[PDB]
UniProtKB/Swiss-Prot annotation, chain A:
This is Small ribosomal subunit protein bS18m. Component of the mitochondrial ribosome (mitoribosome), a dedicated translation machinery responsible for the synthesis of mitochondrial genome-encoded proteins, including at least some of the essential transmembrane subunits of the mitochondrial respiratory chain. The mitoribosomes are attached to the mitochondrial inner membrane and translation products are cotranslationally integrated into the membrane. Present with 1210 molecules/cell in log phase SD medium. Its main location: mitochondrion. The gene is RSM18. It is found in: Mitochondrion. The lineage of its organism: Eukaryota, Fungi, Dikarya, Ascomycota, Saccharomycotina. It comes from the Eukaryota. Belongs to the bacterial ribosomal protein bS18 family. The chain holds residues 40 to 138 of 138 of the full protein.
Curated annotation (Swiss-Prot), chain B:
Belongs to the mitochondrion-specific ribosomal protein mS43 family. Component of the mitochondrial ribosome (mitoribosome), a dedicated translation machinery responsible for the synthesis of mitochondrial genome-encoded proteins, including at least some of the essential transmembrane subunits of the mitochondrial respiratory chain. The mitoribosomes are attached to the mitochondrial inner membrane and translation products are cotranslationally integrated into the membrane. Keywords: Mitochondrion, Ribonucleoprotein, Ribosomal protein, Transit peptide. This is Small ribosomal subunit protein mS43. The keyword Nucleotidyltransferase does not apply. Signal peptide: none annotated. The keyword Glycosyltransferase does not apply. Component of the mitochondrial small ribosomal subunit (mt-SSU). Mature yeast 74S mitochondrial ribosomes consist of a small (37S) and a large (54S) subunit. The 37S small subunit contains a 15S ribosomal RNA (15S mt-rRNA) and 34 different proteins. The 54S large subunit contains a 21S rRNA (21S mt-rRNA) and 46 different proteins. mS43 forms a heterodimer with mS42, building a large protuberance adjacent to the mRNA channel exit in the mt-SSU body. SUPFAM superfamilies: Fe,Mn superoxide dismutase (SOD), C-terminal domain. GO terms for biological process: mitochondrial translation. PANTHER family: 37S RIBOSOMAL PROTEIN S26, MITOCHONDRIAL, SMALL RIBOSOMAL SUBUNIT PROTEIN MS43.
Swiss-Prot record, chain D:
GO terms for molecular function: structural constituent of ribosome. This is Small ribosomal subunit protein uS2m. Component of the mitochondrial small ribosomal subunit (mt-SSU). Mature yeast 74S mitochondrial ribosomes consist of a small (37S) and a large (54S) subunit. The 37S small subunit contains a 15S ribosomal RNA (15S mt-rRNA) and 34 different proteins. The 54S large subunit contains a 21S rRNA (21S mt-rRNA) and 46 different proteins. Belongs to the universal ribosomal protein uS2 family. Present with 6890 molecules/cell in log phase SD medium. Keywords: Mitochondrion, Ribonucleoprotein, Ribosomal protein, Transit peptide. The chain holds residues 128 to 393 of 394 of the full protein. GO terms for biological process: mitochondrial translation. Its main location: mitochondrion. GO terms for cellular component: mitochondrial inner membrane; mitochondrial small ribosomal subunit; mitochondrion. Component of the mitochondrial ribosome (mitoribosome), a dedicated translation machinery responsible for the synthesis of mitochondrial genome-encoded proteins, including at least some of the essential transmembrane subunits of the mitochondrial respiratory chain. The mitoribosomes are attached to the mitochondrial inner membrane and translation products are cotranslationally integrated into the membrane.
Swiss-Prot record, chain E:
One of its GO terms (biological process) is mitochondrial translational initiation. Component of the mitochondrial small ribosomal subunit (mt-SSU). Mature yeast 74S mitochondrial ribosomes consist of a small (37S) and a large (54S) subunit. The 37S small subunit contains a 15S ribosomal RNA (15S mt-rRNA) and 34 different proteins. The 54S large subunit contains a 21S rRNA (21S mt-rRNA) and 46 different proteins. Belongs to the bacterial ribosomal protein bS1 family. InterPro entries: Rbsml_bS1m-like. Keywords: Mitochondrion, Phosphoprotein, Ribonucleoprotein, Ribosomal protein. This is Small ribosomal subunit protein bS1m. Its main location: mitochondrion. Component of the mitochondrial ribosome (mitoribosome), a dedicated translation machinery responsible for the synthesis of mitochondrial genome-encoded proteins, including at least some of the essential transmembrane subunits of the mitochondrial respiratory chain. The mitoribosomes are attached to the mitochondrial inner membrane and translation products are cotranslationally integrated into the membrane. bS1m functionally interacts with the 5'-UTR of mitochondrial mRNAs. Present with 656 molecules/cell in log phase SD medium. It is found in: Mitochondrion.
Length: 91, 271, 244, 266, 199, 84, 66
């Protein structure tokens, strides 16, 4: 067998080109690799530690907007919700 | 003669499909010539029927001409038998189509006029719908398949096999036979003979495997096809009446001229 | 757009056809309608594509090896053939075969006369072309003149598309071996398109299509038509077609 | 016709060269049989059969792609009056104005060639050499396509002073007179400069301004119109559009030259 | 006027789209119009776009998003691959009816992949072709998956895989097989699902 | 988000990283030494490696990026600077 | 003349459909753009099926003659 990284699995029902059978395709795939990214207000999840534990680190540090990819407003609301959750004995 | 038809008679037209000269040249002159050449080919032209001549002499380089001329006569006879003429204006009164006819869009996927069920052929209608999706699809495929033939040939509605499993449309060129069992595997047998000659004096594996498996049927070896209808794509039938630009007009007249009674009368029962 | 070429003396051609071969309504069927029909179809099949910039000879050479472009090839072939034929039966643009043409006949057809080769061409067209096709007298790279009969719209230039054998009916082992050799030679080419070199060029071309003889001769009698064609060739053109 | 070719013997086949000549004979006579091609664009014909300025339509300028201007994000707003609108993220050049300016510039070229002045065709983009050379050769003009040496006009003594010069008559016939060193050393300034890519040729435009040489240029959506005497609004990025406009100007110059020779032969 | 001609011009005929030119997800159908040039125009870098395409591009096909950009380049890829898939499908002969008798954006029938009608037989010098044989490539150990003619299809065996499969392993794709394309439908996403059988 | 830069004096990578292809000889040597560690010294189970090693190191024991050039060549074209 | 879809000098593509649709609208043979567009679509399918059958039959006939 060979390492799965070095191989490319062409999905089912998809068209392909001969290029797809090449290291170029895998390399191009590597280089070019939710609830809050929506109309939902993150400040309504302040009592739901499971949901907003996805937007923190293993130690609990809120993730930068560069990571979360949220809008500025939803980043601010999410940070407020996480801090409030930390204060009220959850989180 | 054994070739003579009933609804076709010298000195008369086929109603809206052919004119007097058109039918004279499409049917009578052509049958006369083919007979006059098949008699040269063999003396069995009267001793035996056409299909017996086609099948017995099949796959014969030496007896090629018998097969060619018998096949052409049989195909032409079938095609002109299936027709009855239509009510559309006679082809000789109508003006001949010019180059502009090439720019007209066909309406085979919008309109349909002459159907099996209209004349009382419910079984043929149902079989065609089961085999070709719809009657409009069948008409489109038939007319396009015949119109696509550049030179001499026929388009055959054919029931695969007395029982039929499914209907199909097939094309034969230059007196080809709609029947498949007689001539199936011929090139493979010739390849085996050629290879044996070489032995006396793997690509073989791939080529012969592909040949045999392509010709291999579904749970059988020989796949037979039973003609139901025939359309003549030869220039010899439509040039005189419709001109260079009028093959499609001729095919539309043919569709309006089909007698579905005979076609249903030819159906191999059912499986 | 591909347009039908203007012929020399078109008015006389429309008034009295070609003397000794075609009537006015026969030449109109074979050229002024068939060539127009073919050029319109080629235009519709190649417009908006690269092939629209190429002459039919170049189109048929480009598309000869591509199976899916066969229809275009057919059109591009027939058009080309139909002008090779018309050109060498037109009254003018008393012509006689050149010394070089007859010399090459004697060096190719077993030292036979031109009339004997004409009869051989009649026979070849009569037998090996059932239905539509073309009759050619062609020159190979070996300076050898031989008779070639194509079915439908085969070309004389490119041997894998000669279409000289009717595979609808039975064939002799000689023909099958010829096809096998040609297939092997095609496979022998290194070019990715899979094309081969073929320097065969047509010297004489006769249109065996129903558009040429049917109106003026009938369902039979194509042998009479071919005889009239070969007895009344424009030998200025045919002599110019042979390399000096 | 074809010297130093040894034919083959009738017994033996054609040779490679004989095959070449044979297929040439075929190509000139029968290869073009079957149909004549009409209403199809051939790139070379813009250079060898450019139209006259009076026969140019908006449609032929548009088919050449002259109307396709730069991206709207690279707009130089001083070109506002030349623009027809924006479409698909680029500015469209008003081809009525392009046609008017092109006719004016073509008439300037024709007038300068008719007066026996020197015409210079400057274009330094990749595939512009063929059109520039042909424009120069049919106008009896001059061209540069490799690189514009800065100072070619304002420092002509240090750059162009060494290259040779020639006395010619009214019919442009070399007289073969011997020139003095003083005459050879003089500046020979163009009477007209036409630049196909003025954005990448600011040095030439500024030198023409200082050296007081009228100039023509193809002005795209990002180019400064006021830097040239006779602008032509149009696409300077497409070789087809550039060659169309250049061929028009070259034909106008050719007509001016033909008129000059005609009166000098009467 | 100039505006009417622009509306009818060939650039205007290409529908606006800004889908990524380097998509790495799943490809079910073409996303970009293929632009072609003749050899004569390619020799002069002419493609009917605003700007001359760089001479590095030797291919005669490309796809593009923007005629011009703030970066002073045209956003294009010199690829016309999706035409060869379509033609290869046309070579297979397997067919896939809404082509017969406010706006709906859903794909209609086949989205132009094939216009062949269902019931027709392929005559051959041997005889009527009973079934369609096509070369292909088994992809991975799994109904297996096969790369056939630019499409990924489902392989079903007569009885079981041969020894070559597990002998080669993940290099099974290196060797060419023969397949019978049983059928070919298309799903709502626009993806063709061919079912084949190894031979 | 797009972070456009101001007009730069240059566009240059300080230490461009390159494709250092590993020497085949060292890989073969590592595999052979692993084989000797596992299957014993002078084991017959990887004599092939020894052979291959001998074949590859026989004559010789051991058997640049262009980003800055293109960046300098293209910076003025792509930087999106406003017109003068 | 966009009374028909096929034009000499043009390919058959989406622009044929759309130009026919615009023609049908400006002649008021249809009032709604949707119906004119659908009519043009069905004519386009009619022509495409003919073209594809022509190609397939041409290849088949070519193989049958060697
Ligand atoms: Mg520009």
């Amino acid at each position: 067998k060979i390492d799965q990284s070095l191989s490319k699995k062409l999905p089912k029902g998809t068209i392909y080109d001969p290029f797809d059978f090449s290291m170029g395709r895998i390399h191009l795939d590597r280089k070019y690799q939710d609830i809050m990214k929506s109309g939902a207000n993150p400040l309504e999840f302040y009592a739901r530690p499971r949901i907003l534990s996805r937007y923190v680190t293993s130690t609990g540090r809120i993730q930068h907007r560069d990571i979360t990819g949220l809008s500025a407003k939803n980043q601010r609301r999410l940070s407020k919700a996480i801090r409030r959750c930390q204060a009220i004995g959850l989180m | 003669t054994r070739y003579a038809l009933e609804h076709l008679k010298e000195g008369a037209p086929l109603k809206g499909l052919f004119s007097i000269e058109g039918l004279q040249k499409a049917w009578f002159d052509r049958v006369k010539y083919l007979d006059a050449k098949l008699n040269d080919c063999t003396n069995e032209a009267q001793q035996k029927p056409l299909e017996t001549l086609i099948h017995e002499n099949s796959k014969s380089a030496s007896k090629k001409h018998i097969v060619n001329y018998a096949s052409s006569l049989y195909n032409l006879k079938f095609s002109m038998s299936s027709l009855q003429g239509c009510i559309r204006t006679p082809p000789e009164e109508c003006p001949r189509l010019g180059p502009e006819a090439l720019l007209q869009t066909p309406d085979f996927n919008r309109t349909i006029s002459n159907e099996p069920l209209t004349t009382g052929n419910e079984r043929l209608q149902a079989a065609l719908i089961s085999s070709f999706g719809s009657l409009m699809e069948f008409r489109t495929l038939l007319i396009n398949s015949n119109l696509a033939i550049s030179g001499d040939g026929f388009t055959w509605l054919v029931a695969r096999r007395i029982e039929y499993d499914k209907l199909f449309i097939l094309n034969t060129y230059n007196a080809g036979t709609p029947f498949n069992f007689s001539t199936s595997g011929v090139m493979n047998e010739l390849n085996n003979q050629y290879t044996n000659m070489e032995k006396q004096r793997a690509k073989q594996a791939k080529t012969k495997f592909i040949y045999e498996t392509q010709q291999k049927g579904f749970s059988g070896k020989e796949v037979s096809y039973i003609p139901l209808l025939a359309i003549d794509a030869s220039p010899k039938t439509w040039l005189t009446d419709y001109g260079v630009f009028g093959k499609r007009e001729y095919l539309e007249r043919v569709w309006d001229s089909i007698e579905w009674k005979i076609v249903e009368s030819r159906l191999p029962q059912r499986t | 757009i591909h347009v039908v070429p203007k012929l020399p003396n078109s008015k006389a051609l429309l008034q009295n056809g070609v003397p000794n071969i075609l009537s006015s309504s026969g030449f109109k069927t074979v050229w002024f309608d068939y060539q127009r029909y073919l050029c319109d179809k080629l235009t519709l099949a190649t417009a908006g594509q690269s092939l629209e910039s190429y002459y039919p000879f170049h189109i048929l050479l480009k598309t000869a090896g591509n199976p899916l472009q066969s229809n275009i090839f057919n059109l591009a072939s027939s058009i080309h053939n139909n002008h090779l034929f018309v050109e060498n039966i037109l009254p003018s643009a008393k012509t006689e075969p050149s010394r070089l043409f007859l010399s090459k006949i004697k060096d190719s057809f077993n030292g036979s006369d031109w009339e004997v080769v004409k009869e051989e061409m009649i026979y070849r067209a009569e037998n090996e072309v059932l239905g539509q096709g073309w009759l050619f007298l062609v020159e190979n790279n070996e300076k050898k003149l031989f008779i070639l009969t194509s079915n439908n719209n085969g070309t004389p230039y490119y041997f894998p598309r000669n279409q000289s054998f009717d595979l609808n009916s039975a064939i002799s082992i000689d023909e099958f071996a010829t096809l096998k050799q040609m297939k092997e030679l095609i496979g022998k080419s290194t070019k990715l398109n899979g094309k081969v070199q073929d320097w065969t060029m047509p010297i004489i071309c006769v249109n065996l299509w129903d558009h040429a003889y049917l109106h003026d001769y009938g369902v039979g009698n194509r042998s009479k038509y071919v005889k009239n064609v070969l007895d009344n060739l424009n030998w200025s053109v045919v002599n110019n077609r042979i390399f000096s | 016709p074809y010297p130093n070719l040894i034919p083959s013997a009738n017994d033996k086949p054609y040779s490679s060269q004989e095959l070449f000549l044979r297929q040439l004979n075929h190509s000139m006579r029968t290869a073009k049989l079957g149909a004549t091609i009409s209403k199809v664009y051939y790139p070379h014909k813009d250079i060898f059969y450019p139209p006259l300025p009076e026969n140019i339509t908006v449609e032929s300028l548009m088919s050449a792609g002259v109307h396709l201007g730069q991206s709207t994000s690279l707009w130089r707003s001083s070109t506002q009056s030349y623009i027809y609108g924006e479409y698909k993220g680029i500015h469209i050049i008003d081809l009525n104005q392009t046609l008017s300016y092109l006719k004016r510039a073509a008439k300037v070229v024709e007038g300068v060639s008719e007066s026996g002045g020197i015409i210079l065709f400057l274009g330094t983009r990749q595939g512009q050499k063929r059109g520039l050379e042909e424009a120069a050769k049919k106008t009896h003009g001059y061209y540069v396509s490799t690189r514009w040496i800065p100072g070619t006009l304002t420092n002509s003594t240090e750059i162009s002073g060494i290259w040779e010069k020639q006395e010619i008559d009214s019919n442009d016939n070399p007289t073969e007179r011997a020139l003095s060193p003083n005459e050879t050393s003089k500046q020979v300034k163009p009477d007209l400069l036409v630049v196909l890519n003025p954005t990448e040729n600011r040095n030439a435009l500024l030198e023409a301004i200082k050296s007081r040489v009228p100039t023509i240029a193809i002005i795209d959506t990002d180019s400064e119109p006021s830097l040239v005497t006779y602008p032509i609004p149009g696409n300077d990025d497409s070789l087809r559009s550039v060659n169309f406009l250049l061929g028009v100007l070259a034909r106008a110059g050719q007509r001016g030259l033909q008129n000059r020779l005609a009166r000098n032969n009467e | 006027t100039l505006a009417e001609l622009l509306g009818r011009s060939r650039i205007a005929q290409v529908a606006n789209n800004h889908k990524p030119l380097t998509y790495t997800g799943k490809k079910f159908h073409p996303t970009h119009q293929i632009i072609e040039t003749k050899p004569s125009t390619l020799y002069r870098q002419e493609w009917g776009l605003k700007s001359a395409i760089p001479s590095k591009i030797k291919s005669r096909y490309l796809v593009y998003n923007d005629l011009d950009t703030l970066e002073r380049i045209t956003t294009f890829e010199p690829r016309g691959g999706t035409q060869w898939n379509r033609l290869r499908f046309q070579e297979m002969g397997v067919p896939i009816n809404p082509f017969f008798k406010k706006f709906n954006t859903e794909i209609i029938g086949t989205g132009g992949l094939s216009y062949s009608l269902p019931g027709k037989l392929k005559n051959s010098p041997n005889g009527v072709i009973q079934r369609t044989v096509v070369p292909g490539r088994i992809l991975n150990v799994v109904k297996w998956l096969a790369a056939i003619g630019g499409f990924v299809a489902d392989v079903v065996f007569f009885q079981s895989p041969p020894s070559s499969f597990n002998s080669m392993g993940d290099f099974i794709r290196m060797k060419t097989f023969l397949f019978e394309i049983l059928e070919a439908s298309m799903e709502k996403n626009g993806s063709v699902s061919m079912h084949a059988r190894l031979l | 988000p797009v972070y456009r830069l101001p007009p730069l004096p240059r566009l240059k990578v300080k230490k461009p990283i390159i494709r250092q292809e590993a020497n085949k000889c060292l890989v073969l040597m590592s595999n052979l030494l692993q084989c000797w560690s596992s299957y014993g010294h002078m084991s017959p189970k990887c004599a092939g490696l020894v052979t291959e090693l001998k074949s590859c190191t026989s004559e010789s024991a051991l058997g640049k990026s262009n980003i800055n050039y293109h960046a300098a060549r293209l910076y003025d074209r792509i930087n999106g600077k406003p017109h003068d | 003349d966009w009374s028909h879809m096929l034009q000499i000098g043009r390919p058959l593509d989406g622009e044929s459909v759309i130009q026919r649709t615009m023609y049908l609208i400006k002649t008021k043979q249809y009032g709604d753009m949707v119906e004119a567009y659908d009519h043009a679509r069905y004519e386009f399918y009619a022509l495409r099926m003919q073209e594809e059958t022509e190609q397939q039959v041409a290849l088949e006939e070519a193989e049958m003659f060697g």
